[PDB]
Amino acid sequence: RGPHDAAIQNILTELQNHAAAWPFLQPVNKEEVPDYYDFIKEPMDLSTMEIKLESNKYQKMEDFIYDARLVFNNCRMYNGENTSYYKYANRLEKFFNNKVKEIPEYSHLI
C-alpha cells in the first residue's frame, strides 16, 4: 500500500460521513447552478477526491490536502459569507484540520 493510502482513505471516509459534507459529496450540478464553472476554475468535491485516491493520484499527502482546500475555498469564493454553504465549508474545514493535525506525521501540513 501507498505510504499515505490508509491515512487518506480514513480521513476521506470521515469527511464524507460528516454532518457538513452533504453540499460537497458530488460535483456541483451546472443545470442547478448555471454560472458555477464560469467562476470556479479548479472545481473539486469528495467523490472526485475518492476517485483520485482509488486511481493512485495521491502519492503526496500534499495533493490530497490541496484538493480538500479547493472544496472549502472554492465554496467560500462562490457563496456569500452569510449563506449556509459558507457555514458548512467552515465547519468541514475545522474538522478536516483537526483530523489531519492529530496524525503526528502530517501535523507540519496544517
Binding site: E32, V33, Y78, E81, T83
Partner: peptide
C-alpha cells in the same frame, strides 16, 4: 438555491 455572491 446556491448562487454567486
Amino acid at each position: 438555491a446556491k448562487r454567486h455572491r
